[PDB]
Amino acid sequence: RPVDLPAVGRMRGAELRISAKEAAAIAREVR
Amino acid sequence: SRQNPSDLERAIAGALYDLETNTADLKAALRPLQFVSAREIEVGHGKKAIVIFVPVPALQGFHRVQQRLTRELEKKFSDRHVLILAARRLTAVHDAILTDLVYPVEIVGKRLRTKEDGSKVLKVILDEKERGGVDYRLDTYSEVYRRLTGRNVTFEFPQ
Amino acid sequence: IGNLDLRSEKQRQAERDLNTALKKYLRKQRKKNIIDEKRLKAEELYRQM
Amino acid sequence: EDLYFLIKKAVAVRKHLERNRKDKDSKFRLILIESRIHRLARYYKTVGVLPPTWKYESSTASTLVA
Amino acid sequence: KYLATGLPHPFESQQQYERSLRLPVGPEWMTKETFQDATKPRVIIKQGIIAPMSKPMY
Amino acid sequence: IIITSCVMAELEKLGPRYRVALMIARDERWQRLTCDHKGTYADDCIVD
Amino acid sequence: RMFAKPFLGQLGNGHVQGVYSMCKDKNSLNCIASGSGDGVVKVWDLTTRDEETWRVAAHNNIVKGLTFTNDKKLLSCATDGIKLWDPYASPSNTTPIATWQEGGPYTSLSFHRSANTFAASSGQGCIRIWDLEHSTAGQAIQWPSFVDTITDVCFNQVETSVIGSVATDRSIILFDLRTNMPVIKTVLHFACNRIVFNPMEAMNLAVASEDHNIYIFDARNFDKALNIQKGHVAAVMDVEFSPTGEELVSGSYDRTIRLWRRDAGHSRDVYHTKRMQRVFRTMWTMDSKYILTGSDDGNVRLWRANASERSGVKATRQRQALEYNNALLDRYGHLPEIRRIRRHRHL
Amino acid sequence: VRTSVLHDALNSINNAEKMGKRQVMIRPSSKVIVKFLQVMQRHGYIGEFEEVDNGKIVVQLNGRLNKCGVISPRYNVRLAELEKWVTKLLPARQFGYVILTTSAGIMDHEEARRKHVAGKIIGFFY
RNA sequence: GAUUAAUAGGGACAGUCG
RNA sequence: GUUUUCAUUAAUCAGGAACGUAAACUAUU
Ligand SMILES: [Zn+2]
Which stretches of chain H sit within 8 Å of chain B by CB?
37-38, 41-42, 44, 47-53
Q: Which chains touch G (3 or more CB pairs under 8 A)?
A: B, C, E, F, H
Burial class (CB in 10 A: 0-12, 13-18, 19+), B71: exposed
Alpha-carbon separation of residue G201 from G160, G198, G290 (angstroms): 13, 6, 21
Residue E26 Cα distances to G320, G328, G337, H65, angstroms: 10, 9, 20, 57
Report the distance separating Cα G143 and Cα F19, nearest Å.
41
**Single-letter amino acid code for the residue at E50:** I
DSSP symbols for G9-69? EE-TT--SS-EEEEEE-SSSSSEEEEEESSSEEEEEESS--SS-SEEEE--SS---EEEE-
Q: How many other C-beta atoms lie within 10 A of the C-beta of residue B86?
A: 18
Q: Tell me the C-alpha distance between G96 and G120, whole Å.
A: 18
Burial of G218: CB neighbours in 10 Å, binned 0-12, 13-18, 19+: middle
CB atoms within 10 A of CB G292: 25
Give the nucleotide nearest to H15 (CA→C1').
Answer: J28
Reduced to 3 states (helix: H, G, I; strand: E, B; else coil), residue B137 is: helix
- Give the count of Cβ contacts less than 8 A between chain C and E: 32
Any atom of strand J under 7 A from CB of H92?
Answer: no
CA distance B126 to chain G (A): 15
Strands of G247-252's sheet in order across? G236-241, G247-252, G257-261, G267-271
Neighbours of D61 (CB within 10 A): 16
Nearest nt to the H1 alpha carbon by C1': J11
The C-alpha atoms of residue A1 and residue H125 are separated, in whole angstroms, by: 20
Contacts 24+ apart (CB under 8 A), B144-149: B144/B43, B144/B49, B144/B51, B144/B83, B144/B101, B145/B97, B145/B98, B145/B101, B147/B41, B148/B51, B148/B85, B148/B97, B149/B94, B149/B97
Contact G277 F19 (CB under 8 A): yes
Record the resolution, in angstroms.
4.0
Are G172 and G195 in contact, with CB atoms under 8 Å apart?
yes
Say if residues G167 and G173 touch (Cβ distance below 8 Å): yes
Q: Which residues contact E55 (CB under 8 A, 6 or more apart)?
A: none
Cα–Cα distance, G186 to G181 (Å, whole number): 16
Rounded CA-CA distance G33/G294 in Å is 10
d(CA G72, CA G307): 32
Q: Which nucleotide is nearest to D28 (CA to C1')?
A: J18
Q: Could you tell me which of G156, G99, G108, G147 has the C-alpha nearest to residue G128? A: G108
Rounded to the nearest angstrom, the distance between the alpha carbon of F32 and the centre of ligand 1 is 11
Give the burial class of H120: count Cβ atoms within 10 A of its Cβ; 0-12 exposed, 13-18 middle, 19 or more buried.
middle
Tell me how crowded residue G105 is: count the other CB atoms within 10 A of its CB: 23
Q: Is residue G108 helix, strand or coil?
A: strand
Measured between alpha carbons, how far is G111 from B59 in angstroms, rounded to an integer? 55
| CA-based end-to-end distance of chain A | 32
Q: Is G89 helix (H, G, I), strand (E, B) or coil?
A: coil
> What is the CA(G293)–ligand 1 centre distance, in A?
24
Q: Tell me which H or E stretch contains G152.
A: strand G150-155
Closest chain A C-alpha to H11 CA, distance in angstroms = 5
Gap from CA of F37 to ligand 1 centroid (Å): 6
What Å value separates CA F22 and C1' J25? 49
- DSSP string over F18-45: GHHHHHHHT-TTSEEE----SS--HHHH
Hey, is the C-beta of G105 within 8 angstroms of any chain B C-beta?
Answer: yes
Residue G168's closest CA among G141, G195, G144?
G195
Q: Which of G167, G162, G179, G168 is nearest to G110 (CA)?
A: G162
Protein chain H, residues 12-31, with a C-beta closer than 7 Å to any atom of nucleic acid strand J: 12, 15, 19, 25-27
The dihedral built from the CA positions of residue G314, G320, G323 and G325, taken in this order, carries a sign that is negative
User: CA G170 to CA G188: how far, in whole Å?
Assistant: 6
> For residue G79, which phi and psi values (nearest 5 degrees)?
-65, -20
H95 alpha-carbon distance from chain centroid: 14
Q: Are H85 and H64 in contact (CB under 8 A)?
A: no
Rounded Cα–Cα distance for residues G107 and G30 (Å): 26
**Phi, psi torsion values for G218, nearest 5 degrees:** -95, 125
Strand partners, H105: H102
What are the distances in angstroms from CA H106 to CA B18, G60, H28, H103, H125? 59, 20, 20, 8, 14
State whether residue F33 sits within 8 Å of chain A by CB: no
Cβ contact B95:B62 at 8 Å: no
| Phi-psi category of residue A23: left, alpha or beta, with phi > 0 → left and psi -120 to 50 → alpha | alpha
Nearest protein residue to the C1' atom of I7, measured from CA? H27
CA distances from G213 to G51, G169, G178, G206, G267 (A): 36, 17, 32, 10, 12
In whole angstroms, what is the distance from residue B32 CA to residue G289 CA?
83
SS3 H102: strand
Residue B35 burial class via C-beta count within 10 angstroms: exposed 0-12, middle 13-18, buried 19 and up = middle
The answer to whether B154 contacts chain G (CB < 8 Å) is yes
H68, H124 contact by CB (below 8 A): yes
- Tell me how far CA of residue H32 lies from CA of B112, H6, H42, H63, H77, in angstroms: 16, 7, 15, 22, 19
Contacts of strand I, CB cut-off 7 Å? B 92; D 2, 5-6, 9, 36, 40; H 1, 27-28, 54-56
The C-alpha atoms of residue E45 and residue G244 are separated, in whole angstroms, by 8
Inform me whether the C-beta atom of residue G185 falls under 8 Å from chain B C-beta atoms: no
Q: Is C16 on the interface with E (CB under 8 A)?
A: no
**Would an 8 Å CB–CB cutoff place B25 in contact with chain G?**
no
Q: What's the residue count for chain H?
A: 126
- Give the type of residue at E44: I
Per residue, the 3-state secondary structure of G112-130, as one string, reads CCCCCEEEEECCCCEEEEE
Sheet containing strand G19-24, edge to edge, reads: G19-24, G31-36, G40-45, G54-57
- By what technique were these coordinates determined? cryo-EM
Q: Measured at the alpha carbon of residue G285, what is the angle toward residues G283 and G288, in degrees to the nearest 5? A: 105
Whole-number distance in Å between D3 CA and J20 C1' = 33
Alpha helices in chain B (DSSP H): 9-20, 58-64, 69-76, 91-101, 138-148
